[PDB]
Design a binder for this molecule. Structure first.
Ligand SMILES: CCCCCCCCO[C@@H]1O[C@H](CO)[C@@H](O)[C@H](O)[C@H]1O
Ligand SMILES: CCCCCCCCO[C@@H]1O[C@H](CO)[C@@H](O)[C@H](O)[C@H]1O
Ligand SMILES: CCCCCCCCO[C@@H]1O[C@H](CO)[C@@H](O)[C@H](O)[C@H]1O
Ligand SMILES: O[C@]1(c2ccc(Cl)cc2)c2ccccc2C2=NCCN21
Ligand code: NA
Ligand code: NA
Length: 504
């Protein structure tokens, strides 16, 4: 079995998995909307009661499976629970990261495309008033993606966007086809320091921003001034538990799969804690110091609330690019911003495609080359739905990327700590540990963590599911149809896997 070569490489690949575009865009917007500095109270709590416990569990489950030659959840769930229904539930740990990959690699390609256009100067140059600067960049994005100009839900990506997507798939494959240590691990040791340098440069340059409308200090101010009155709102605590769960990449199968290349008695307690910490530091220190302070510096604290409500995507793809076109050397600044987002995405997508690759290798005995190429083929092909059908992306992101992962997070806990056995699970986590998990976490993992996840799941199911089902366009059924088909196909592959095993 492939293994991580060095402890540092393992930590950087895992941190690389967790650190993504959300760290630099989603987290700052969530924090501003949910109590500013006060948001750190439920955020740390969520990290301590949900993020950290579940992450350890996924590492444990992964390492446990890897020791027996299985890196994915259909086989691993079955090892923890010898039941047919365990294998079927395990398909979700293959289906979730596959579906997310189908839209994520494409979004990732946008950052590469924007980076290139900025570098060579193929970007708008306004002209005054805020909308006069924002609008040319809104149009730039819309022409790139091919946002529908009619009533048809049809996207028409530019030729540039399509080719960059091809290049982005190629880069992912280039890394993945080299394997865990010589591919994913090797790239982690380059990308994570590169990521750190890019962010630190941006933080310094953003902190120097001074405009007639404000400063970066005003931005840091608006973001970090506590509003403890928002702590009464349960939706702020839901937002925190959700933000932590998504930022750490829990429930995607990626962590389990990556952990399966950790040797049987190699530490996961300290390595896991360190990886999660890297993600948090990148999130609150770097992510919180770039996008929002930059936006508030240029548009003024008066528009801070409006900026936050316009969302993470507009901030990262419209607002910030517009600001850069109005700042000195902003052209090279825009390149760095999107180069940073690209590496953030790239380190996450290679990790997110590994479960499908590992399944083909482990259960269908494909060579790494064949497993990588076929996985890429399925993802490349399916992505055409995301590129050409308006709102298809959102539909996939809701079922697999939002509802899916929390359901799968809960399923993991129950199978491991309740069905497999809490005592067997606890020993599995702490074995080989450089440090031991605090005894208090035995109760957290068993009662607190699933409770939190159960509550989040129900709240979101009651809140969002009726909306998606009743108020969306008929074309959502196309996306629902396709992704349900994918689940059928993966179930069949799992069916073929157990049949081959019966023969040999
Ligand atoms: C059917 C799934 C695989 C084939 C999908 C069709 C590929 C579409 O290819 C298209 O080529 C055009 C060149 O003019 C580009 O401008 C489009 O953006 C690109 O998507
Ligand atoms: C769901 C898979 C996506 C199908 C790929 C669309 C291929 C459409 O193909 C071409 O599209 C061009 C604009 O896109 C048009 O100029 C052409 O008339 C059309 O033939
Ligand atoms: C972390 C933030 C980056 C992810 C945000 C990408 C999601 C944006 O996807 C959106 O799909 C829409 C469908 O109607 C299009 O109209 C939008 O213009 C397109 O940006
Ligand atoms: O960027 C992801 C991720 C997950 C899977 C893939 Cl294939 C690609 C990227 C992601 C997407 C959506 C929601 C959360 C997360 C996430 N957390 C860590 C890496 N990662
Ligand atoms: Na993250
Ligand atoms: Na990443």
């Amino acid at each position: 079995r492939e293994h991580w070569a060095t402890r540092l490489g393992l930590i950087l690949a895992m941190a690389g998995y967790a650190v993504d575009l959300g760290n630099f865009l989603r987290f700052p917007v969530q924090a501003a909307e949910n109590g500013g500095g006060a948001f750190m109270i439920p955020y740390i709590i969520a990290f301590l009661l949900v993020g950290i416990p579940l992450m350890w569990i996924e590492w444990a489950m992964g390492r446990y499976g890897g020791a027996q030659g299985h890196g994915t959840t259909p086989a691993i769930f079955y090892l923890l629970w010898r039941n047919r229904f365990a294998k079927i539930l395990g398909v979700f740990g293959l289906w979730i990261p596959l579906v997310v990959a189908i839209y994520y690699v494409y979004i990732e390609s946008w950052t590469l495309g924007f980076a290139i256009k900025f570098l060579v100067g193929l970007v708008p140059e306004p002209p005054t008033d805020p909308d006069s600067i924002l609008r040319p960049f809104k149009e730039f994005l819309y022409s790139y993606i091919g946002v529908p100009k009619g009533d048809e839900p049809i996207l028409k990506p530019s030729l540039f966007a399509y080719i960059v997507f091809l290049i982005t798939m190629f880069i992912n494959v280039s890394i993945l086809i080299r394997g865990i240590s010589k591919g994913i691990e090797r790239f982690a040791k380059i990308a994570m320091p590169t990521l750190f340098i890019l962010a630190v440069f941006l933080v310094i340059r953003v902190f120097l921003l001074e405009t007639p409308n404000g400063t970066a200090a005003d931005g840091l101010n608006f973001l970090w001034t506590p509003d403890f009155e928002k702590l009464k709102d349960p939706g702020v605590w839901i937002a925190a538990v959700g933000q932590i769960f998504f930022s750490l990449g829990l429930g995607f199968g990626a962590i389990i799969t990556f952990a399966s290349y950790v040797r049987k008695d190699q530490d996961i307690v300290l390595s896991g804690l360190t990886a999660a910490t890297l993600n948090e530091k990148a999130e609150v220190i770097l992510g919180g110091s770039i996008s929002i302070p930059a936006a508030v510096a240029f548009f003024g604290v008066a528009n801070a609330v409006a900026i936050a409500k316009a969302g993470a995507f507009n901030l990262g793809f419209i607002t910030l690019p517009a600001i850069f076109s109005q700042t000195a050397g902003g052209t090279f600044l825009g390149f760095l911003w999107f180069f940073l987002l690209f590496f953030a995405g790239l380190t996450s997508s290679i990790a997110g495609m590994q479960p499908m690759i590992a399944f083909l290798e482990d259960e269908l005995k494909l060579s790494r080359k064949h497993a990588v190429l076929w996985t890429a083929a399925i993802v490349f092909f399916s992505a055409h739905l995301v590129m050409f059908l308006n709102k298809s992306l959102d539909e996939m992101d809701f079922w697999a990327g939002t509802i899916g992962v929390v359901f799968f997070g809960l399923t993991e806990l129950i199978i491991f700590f309740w069905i497999f056995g809490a005592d067997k699970a606890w020993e599995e986590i702490n074995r080989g540990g450089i440090i031991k998990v605090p005894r208090i976490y035995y109760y957290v993992m068993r009662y607190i963590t699933p409770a939190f996840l159960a509550v989040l799941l129900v709240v979101w199911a009651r809140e969002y599911i009726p909306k998606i089902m009743e108020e969306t366009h008929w074309t959502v059924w196309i996306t629902r149809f396709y992704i349900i088909g994918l689940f059928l196909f993966l179930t069949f592959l799992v069916f073929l896997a157990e049949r081959r095993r019966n023969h040999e």
